Write a protein that binds this ligand. Structure first.
Ligand SMILES: COc1cc(CNC(=O)Cc2cn(CCCC[C@H]3C[C@@H]4Cc5nc6cc(Cl)ccc6c(N)c5[C@H](C3)C4)nn2)ccc1O
Ligand SMILES: COc1cc(CNC(=O)Cc2cn(CCCC[C@H]3C[C@@H]4Cc5nc6cc(Cl)ccc6c(N)c5[C@H](C3)C4)nn2)ccc1O
Ligand SMILES: [Cl-]
Ligand SMILES: [Cl-]
Lengths: 532, 532
């Protein structure tokens, strides 16, 4: 009864799940779109046709077709991110965790997974919404969206493969939440979207996109922003990559209709097998099929929208991790290894810089090298390693986010900024990688509250603080509880630019997050590359 | 008798001068060239014709015609550098201080004054060679040379104003020392030339010039090097400035012969009155008439000579002061004043950068600004002031000297490098100016040994250490006395790049003097400006 919900598309039957020492309801694998299969591959999603009978929402759905990381087989640190369900193009489902007893009209949070727009699953253990829904009394939704070529192959001008359809998948799930979350006890006028990495970029893209803005109230962006250099391409570059994808699969390339028809006859794994072959440069932190600046989802360039205030004005909470670059260097840069401290030679440093800034000319590469090299101590393998780590994280995550924060705050209604720099005590990744891209998520989703997962008591307390910040922000637009005597997370303002550290020690307020390096990345290096 | 010396140009009669609690002999105002007056203005010097009778060498000679600093009338800090004798184009004389009793064959040191190639006198109180000659038992020579347009007006191709004649003045004095210092008790095979600022650049130019190299044994360069950006111009730029000088004086400009003839009829002060009007840029630390890269005194570019080892291979001792830039900012940059702490606004900082790097385009100016700005604290007037101080000293003195040191040491026979960072207790200049350009000279010449000058006992001890370093280097090629248990000043080597601080505390050895900034000035910024 508590597990049966009538929605506008039909009835759904959930399941009662244990969480800590209580229970909540879960509605898993609810369809929000028609299966984008067959001649619907690459096309914009269509709403799910209403169904007769009762939809069995007791088990997780399929994951979308995607590249699977096999670099460390059996290693939990990498396999925890891989699809844990069967992959299928039939994958547009969402999941809902609902407090028990069912609320009347409570705050909703919608999670958008990341994964470079080429990977991601709503069903990962680390995305289990039951601890957040139970602890903070929110309705927690996780959506899914097509990734890779399936979600982002872009042949602008065509209506069969227009690009951005993964983002339209996200939007269709938000539309379904807007239309139906009331029946689960959610308040559709108090929806917060939040996401990490490409999901953080996606959140920012719905803030910008006129077609998405009305479908949520406020937003949280973790380690990703819409202006990140990896997060979008021009329509010309998307077309070049789509044509190169067909060339890899022996397709007729004489027209969009012939190319799209050829690509639609291929099995999913044949696209995945060649997807990485279309990148224009030898690079790390660059992905083949990503959002395209198309003039429809995004009416103009991202920079001109941010400059003019052409975006949703609301409250945002966002931040970054200390060592965003380390994951990408481990997988893609010579000299880095999982089982060594990865001290980097001068030659491997120069190779890494070239991989990390693929669009740079030799003068640009010299500028990056000078900015990040201690010339009193240039053969220090630890400083070279940490310098490359900083280059990758500053260029790809931190400095684009700081540019976004400063543009947004001029027109927005409240900005809260964090710097997550706690390394978990039970981390299976080597110590040189520090505070890794993606490893704040387990604190946001409350995994340290689970005794068997071997976190410390301080880490459980940190997780509870973070979950309460997130859910209080979602509820009110302010992560701070009023009338409480805890230290206050201050607003980020244009003038004072305050942020907080997120770790196990007492809260410290700082100003101008990595301002020196972000002047280099956001102002000087673009000017240098444009003049040369 | 001890005061009478027969030389190859004739007899000279010196004077007995008191020094501390003893006496030495002084031979002041000995002519080494014919007076470069009349139709000899701008021409290469001619040897002084031998004279009958006894030359009265008991009084200082005239100083060369030059610009006189009147920015702080009556202020000893600036007036101590001005001519202290009557100015005259009849000014090619040298001075000799000789220990008593007259030595047989002792080390000779020849001082070359600086002053931006536009000023300087051999007769300044701070250049009095009697303390060094007495204390260290050397024969101390100070020469003179034409400065300004008189010494450096350059119309390449003409034999009436070929350029570089001030450097040929220096060379003619060195030739006279080579030919005659034996009669004063000097060893002509153990001559060290030393000089500060433009005199340091000049010393380096005689190391490079094939026509000068045979006239001395080893060399000391203080706060100046031949490759400094202010120390030379091309023949085209020298010609442009000579023509502009004539335009300022209503000269016929249709041929070299007409221009030179017009310039030779002008009184000296009319040239001096307009000399600063010919500079191509709004600048500081740039001078109108300087050595020209002519293909004769310098056979090729300074850089190609340093790269190929086309220079005298010997021992060198050289170094810089901590705050070389402060003097130039005080006189030439907005926001700096003698009687205030000169806290610099953001706007005056940007004006100062533009003055300090006049050849830079806007991208180059942004690169300099980023390198020297703390963007966590960019409105700190003390940091802006000290940042400009560092820009001026790094660009104009320290980084060119470090480029010279590293090129020279590849082929040379021994390099000793110092960093003078002691601020004298009795300095009359404000504290913001720090360790000023030129203020190591009083320690080299032993002024702290004079009780009435109000130095401390530690500063007398520092002066004695420096004088002993200099004279022991002059004597042996090594500033360290063998068999002594004092801490050793190590050789500067290509690999370890060691240097010492010179101050009142116990000697400390460091490595890679200002290497971070000099990579910027010597490698990155030239590459940036060449590509743009
Ligand atoms: C793998 O083999 C090669 C790899 C390369 C180098 N490849 C690349 O540079 C392509 C690339 C791939 N990526 C990864 C994008 C990030 C996707 C995810 C983001 C989210 C957080 C996260 N963090 C992880 C951290 C570690 Cl240590 C390990 C796995 C992580 C992970 N899967 C995720 C997911 C995916 C969610 N960046 N660049 C070259 C040649 C190769 O043969
Ligand atoms: C003075 O009026 C103006 C001045 C300017 C600015 N002028 C300039 O930038 C031209 C310039 C002149 N200079 C000086 C070159 C250095 C020459 C001397 C070097 C040696 C060491 C020395 N140090 C001194 C330190 C102080 Cl604090 C004061 C005087 C010093 C001094 N005369 C010397 C001499 C000269 C020997 N650099 N740039 C613009 C407009 C003006 O009306
Ligand atoms: Cl680390
Ligand atoms: Cl200072």
């Amino acid at each position: 009864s508590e597990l049966l919900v009538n929605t506008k598309s039909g009835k759904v039957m959930g399941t009662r799940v244990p969480v800590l020492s209580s229970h909540i309801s879960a509605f898993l694998g609810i369809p929000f779109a028609e299966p984008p299969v067959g001649n619907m591959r690459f096309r914009r999603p269509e709403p799910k046709k209403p169904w007769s009978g009762v939809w069995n929402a007791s088990t997780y759905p399929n994951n979308c077709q995607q590249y699977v990381d096999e670099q460390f087989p059996g290693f939990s640190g990498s396999e925890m991110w891989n699809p844990n369900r069967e992959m299928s193009e039939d994958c547009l489902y969402l999941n809902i965790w609902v407090p028990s007893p069912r609320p009347k009209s409570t705050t909703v949070m919608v999670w958008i997974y990341g994964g470079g727009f080429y990977s991601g699953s709503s069903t990962l253990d680390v995305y289990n919404g039951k601890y957040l829904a139970y602890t903070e009394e929110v309705v927690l939704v996780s959506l899914s969206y097509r990734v890779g070529a399936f979600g982002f192959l872009a042949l602008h001008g065509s209506q069969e493969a227009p690009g951005n359809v993964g983002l339209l998948d996200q939007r269709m799930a938000l539309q379904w939440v807007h239309d139906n979350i009331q029946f689960f006890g959610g308040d559709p006028k108090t929806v917060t979207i939040f996401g990490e990495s490409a999901g953080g970029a996606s959140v920012g893209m719905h803030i910008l996109s006129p077609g998405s803005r009305d479908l949520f109230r406020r937003a949280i962006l973790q380690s990703g922003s819409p202006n990140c250099p990896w997060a979008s391409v021009s329509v010309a570059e998307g077309r070049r990559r789509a044509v190169e994808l067909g060339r890899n699969l022996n397709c007729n390339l004489n027209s969009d209709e012939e190319l799209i028809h050829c690509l639609r006859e291929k099995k999913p794994q044949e696209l995945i097998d060649v997807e990485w072959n279309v990148l224009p440069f030898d690079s790390i932190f660059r992905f083949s099929f990503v959002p395209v600046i198309d003039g429809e989802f995004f009416p103009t360039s991202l920079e001109s929208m941010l400059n003019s205030g052409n975006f949703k004005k609301t409250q945002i909470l966002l931040g970054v991790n200390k060592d965003e670059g380390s994951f990408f260097l481990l997988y893609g840069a010579p000299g880095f290894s999982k089982d060594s401290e990865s001290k980097i030679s001068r030659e491997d440093f120069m190779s890494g810089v070239k991989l990390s800034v693929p669009h740079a000319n030799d003068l640009g590469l010299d500028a990056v090298t000078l900015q990040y090299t201690d010339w009193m101590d240039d053969n220090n393998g630890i400083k070279n390693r940490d310098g490359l780590d900083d280059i990758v994280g500053d260029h790809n995550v931190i400095c684009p986010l700081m540019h976004f924060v400063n543009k947004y705050t001029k027109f927005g209604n409240g900005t809260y900024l964090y710097f997550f720099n706690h390394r978990a005590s039970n981390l299976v990744w080597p110590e040189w990688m520090g505070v890794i891209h993606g490893y704040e998520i387990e604190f946001v989703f409350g995994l340290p509250l689970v005794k068997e997962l071997n976190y410390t008591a301080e880490e459980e307390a940190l997780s509870r603080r973070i979950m309460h910040y997130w859910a209080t922000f979602a509820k009110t637009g302010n992560p701070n509880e009023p009338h409480s005597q805890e230290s206050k997370w201050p607003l980020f303002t244009t003038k004072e630019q305050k942020f907080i550290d997120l770790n196990t020690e007492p809260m410290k307020v700082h100003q101008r997050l990595r301002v020196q390096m972000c002047v280099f990345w956001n102002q000087f290096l673009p000017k240098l590359l444009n003049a040369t």
